[model samples]
Target: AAPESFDEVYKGRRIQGRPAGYEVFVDGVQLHVMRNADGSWISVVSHYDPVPTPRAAARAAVDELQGAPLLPF
Candidate 1:
């Protein structure tokens, strides 16, 4: 099952997550997110690591970005 939706700004970047097939966004740019069978979450930028929730996946993407702009997916 998907986790509850979340929206917040982290490290000066706006991150949002919702239940539209488990969507995630970083600074308004869509980040492809997926849910694994083990109830972990992952984003395109951080696909190798599984986070506990969609919010964490978003934050991971932002951390991977390192202040760089995210391209639309």
Candidate 2:
């Protein structure tokens, strides 16, 4: 299923979620999300926690960010 994407401001930073088949991107960085057999989502930045949905994945990244500004080039 093609994941539904989203965009918004999170903790003074932008949180974006888009399509990912092979090449992908979110915010100003590459977003890598893999699914496990149990049907949970994980990201390279937040590999420690499994999220329920892709939308939350973006939200998770923002949460992990802890209001720190990004310096993506």
Candidate 3:
């Protein structure tokens, strides 16, 4: 089950997440993103840690990123 799309600031950083099969993006740059067959969200940065929502996953990515700039893939 996918959660609603959201926009918020986590850890003093702007972060947003959309439901693209549980896809998440940070500052418009897609990084940590995933959806489970059960009912959980995931991120590339925190691949092992699973959240219950897209925004949570996105925020988690931002938290892991800290203030370092993300490199494009």
Candidate 4:
């Protein structure tokens, strides 16, 4: 089942996630994310870290960016 959609600002960056195959974006830039077999989530910017949810993954991406703009997908 798809997770509920979320849109919020994390550390001054706009982060959004929805049900389109679980798509996520940061500051308007698409951030590739995937669900692991263990029910964890991972984003391109935080590939090695498995988070509990897309929202957490989005926040992790923002943390990885560290104020740097996200590159185009």
Q: List the candidates ranked by lDDT, beginning with the highest.
A: 4, 1, 3, 2
User: Per-residue lDDT for 1-73 in model 2, tens only?
Assistant: 6566777776666667766642234456756677656766777668989988766766776777676543443
What is the TM-score of each predicted model, taking all chains together?
0.94, 0.67, 0.79, 0.95
User: Could you say which candidate leads in lDDT?
Assistant: 4
Residue 22, candidate 2: C-alpha displacement in angstroms = 7.3
TM-score, prediction 4: 0.95
State the lDDT of candidate 3 residue by residue for 1-73, as single tens digits. 4578777777766677666765555666767577777778787788898988777777777778887766655
| Candidate no. 1 TM-score | 0.94
Better of 2 and 3 by TM-score: 3
Which ranges in model 3 have alpha carbons more than 4 Å from their true place? Answer: none
lDDT of 4 by residue, 12-69 (tens): 8899999987999898889999999988999988899999999999999888888998
Q: Per-residue lDDT tens digits of candidate 1, residues 19-43?
A: 8778888888999999898999888
Worst 10 residues of 4 by lDDT: 64-73
- A best-first ranking of the candidates according to their TM-score comes to 4, 1, 3, 2
- The 0-to-1 C-alpha lDDT of every candidate, in the order given, reads 0.89, 0.65, 0.73, 0.92
lDDT for model 2: 0.65
